[PDB]
Amino acid sequence: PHSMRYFETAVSRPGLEEPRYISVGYVDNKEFVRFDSDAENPRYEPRAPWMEQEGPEYWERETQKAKGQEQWFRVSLRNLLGYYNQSAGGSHTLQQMSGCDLGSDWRLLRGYLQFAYEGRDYIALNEDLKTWTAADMAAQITRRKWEQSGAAEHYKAYLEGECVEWLHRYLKNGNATLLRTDSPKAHVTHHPRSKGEVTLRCWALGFYPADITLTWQLNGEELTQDMELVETRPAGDGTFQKWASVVVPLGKEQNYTCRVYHEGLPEPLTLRWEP
Amino acid sequence: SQLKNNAKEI
Amino acid sequence: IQKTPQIQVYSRHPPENGKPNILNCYVTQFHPPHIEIQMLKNGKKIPKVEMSDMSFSKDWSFYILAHTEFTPTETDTYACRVKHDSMAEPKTVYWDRDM
């Protein structure tokens, strides 16, 4: 399985004609291109090494598309001000996510088109790529307008066509980096907690991709409802970090084992506190 | 290569 | 609707006093996207703080990574201070080498 997504944000700037618009492309959850209207000379830039394989014609065409989107978001932002009886003079945000997932059979598994206003669900294209799910009353206005205009067909065509074509290309071009792993480096630390009780923390560092599972066991059972699991966070060098901790009786630390599961590990790691 | 939205705005 | 940021402050590598490292302040789950982030050494702003470009996650919420070179020591404190409209006052979170 594999995916391409563009994540777009327009933020209105009070008194100003143009919003700030940012578009970020992802393949398999790795940022690979970015456009930002706030630059001196706004242009799409590569964000993954393997996008060096595209020539100047690619960057020109995609740059022109971004400026088109910026205008589409400008007009939409104004329309939304009216739907919600909002005064101008404040900032508002409009976001879009779109793209496609490929299955293991390498065909289109699903296409996506979703919009959010003020960080809340607004309208989405249904999986059928024909009907819309409008989140509130204002969005029903848009749903009816897009049904009237037959907007969905145009989106369907991109998602089943150009989205799939380009994701295949990016996967081929980026194969050697996108298909790689960096298995976690793991260790257990030991910490004071409270009277007669200590914390064991099982660390996983420098891993890629970000998907991972950490578990703790006592007497052959997972501590499902009894561990603190930190949110996965970037190391800042392209790899990720996570940890899982448990509070345990002082003197019983050796009864606990941490397991680490990751694509880069043929067999899961089994770890313990080692004083 | 990203989607150009339908000429129809929100 | 305003979503208050979650903040993690943590080193890129396991810390060793006297050895250079990178300190990260990862700020997530916030809305709207405007945010102001400072990193501090003993209550003083660190001048060379780099800021990632901003992104948003599948739940629509924004995220950003601030980072700077640092050398952990026994007595210096490090923290990240975040100012966001979801909060009445800036939130300061200390680096804890155990987390």
Structural domain spans, chain A: 1-180, 181-271
Furthest CA-CA distance within chain B: 22
Nearest to residue A239, comparing CAs of A213, A262, A210?
A: A210
* Amino acid symbol at A59: W
How large is the C-alpha radius of gyration of chain C?
Answer: 14
What's the Cα-to-Cα distance from A62 to each of A59, A71, A98, A187, rounded to whole Å? 5, 15, 15, 45
Distance of CA C63 to the CA centre of its chain: 11
| Pairwise CB contact (< 8 Å): A62 & B9 | no
Q: Where are the alpha helices (DSSP H) in A122-219?
A: 137-149, 151-160, 162-173, 175-178
Contacts of A150 (CB under 8 A, 6+ apart): none
Quick one: which H or E segment has residue A75? helix A56-83
A92 min Cα distance to partner chain B (Å): 14
Shortest CA distance from B9: residue in chain A = A76
Element spanning A72, H or E: helix A56-83
A122-153: b (≥16 Cβ within 10 Å) or e: bbbbeeebeebebbeebbebbbeebeeeebbe
Strand A20-27 with A30-36, pairing: antiparallel
Judge whether A250 is closer than 8 Å to chain C, CB to CB: no
Q: Which of C3, C15, C18 is nearest to C95 (CA)?
A: C15
Q: For chains B and A, tell me whether 3 or more CB atom pairs sit within 8 A of each other.
A: yes
Question: What fold is seen in the domain A181-271?
Answer: Immunoglobulin-like (2.60.40)
Hey, are the CB atoms on B2 and A98 less than 8 Å from each other? yes
> What beta strand segments (E) does chain A contain?
2-11, 20-27, 30-36, 45-46, 93-102, 108-117, 120-125, 132-134, 185-194, 197-207, 213-218, 221-222, 228-229, 233-234, 240-249, 256-261, 269-271
**Break positions in chain C: residue before each gap, C to N over 2.5 angstroms:** none
Cα–Cα separations (whole angstroms), residue C25 to A24, A31, C7, C40? 22, 20, 7, 11
Q: Are A218 and A256 in contact (CB under 8 A)?
A: yes
Distance (Å) from the alpha carbon of B5 to chain A's nearest alpha carbon? 7
Q: Residue A236 is nearest to which of C1, C61, C65, comparing CB atoms?
A: C65
Q: Domains along chain C? A: 1-99 (2.60.40.10)
Question: What burial class does residue A274 get, using C-beta atoms within 10 Å of its C-beta: 0-12 exposed, 13-18 middle, 19+ buried?
Answer: exposed
Residue A229 at interface with chain C, using a CB cutoff of 8 Å: no
Q: Do the Cβ atoms of A68 and B8 come within 8 Å?
A: no
Q: Residues A26, A28, A29, CA angle at the centre, nearest 5°?
A: 55
Which CATH code is given to the segment(s) A1-180? 3.30.500.10
Q: What is the spatial distance between Cα A145 and Cα A113, in angstroms, rounded to a whole number?
A: 16
* Residue in chain A lying closest to B1 (CA): A166
Work out the minimum CA distance from A222 to partner chain B, whole angstroms: 44
Q: Would you call A36 and C98 a contact, using CB atoms and an 8 Å cutoff?
A: no
Asked if C94 reaches chain A (Cβ–Cβ under 8 Å), the answer is no
Task: Tell me if the bond preceding A56 is cis, omega within 30° of 0.
Answer: no
| DSSP assignment letter at C74 | S
Asked if C32's CB is within 8 angstroms of A91's CB, the reply is yes
Asked if A235 has any chain C CB less than 8 Å from its own CB, the reply is yes
Residue to mutate among A233, A240, A242, A245, with most C CBs inside 10 A, is A233
3-class SS of residue C85: coil
Question: What 3-state DSSP class applies to A230?
Answer: coil
- Name the residue type at position A228: E
**In the block, residue with structure tokens 């050796």:** A254
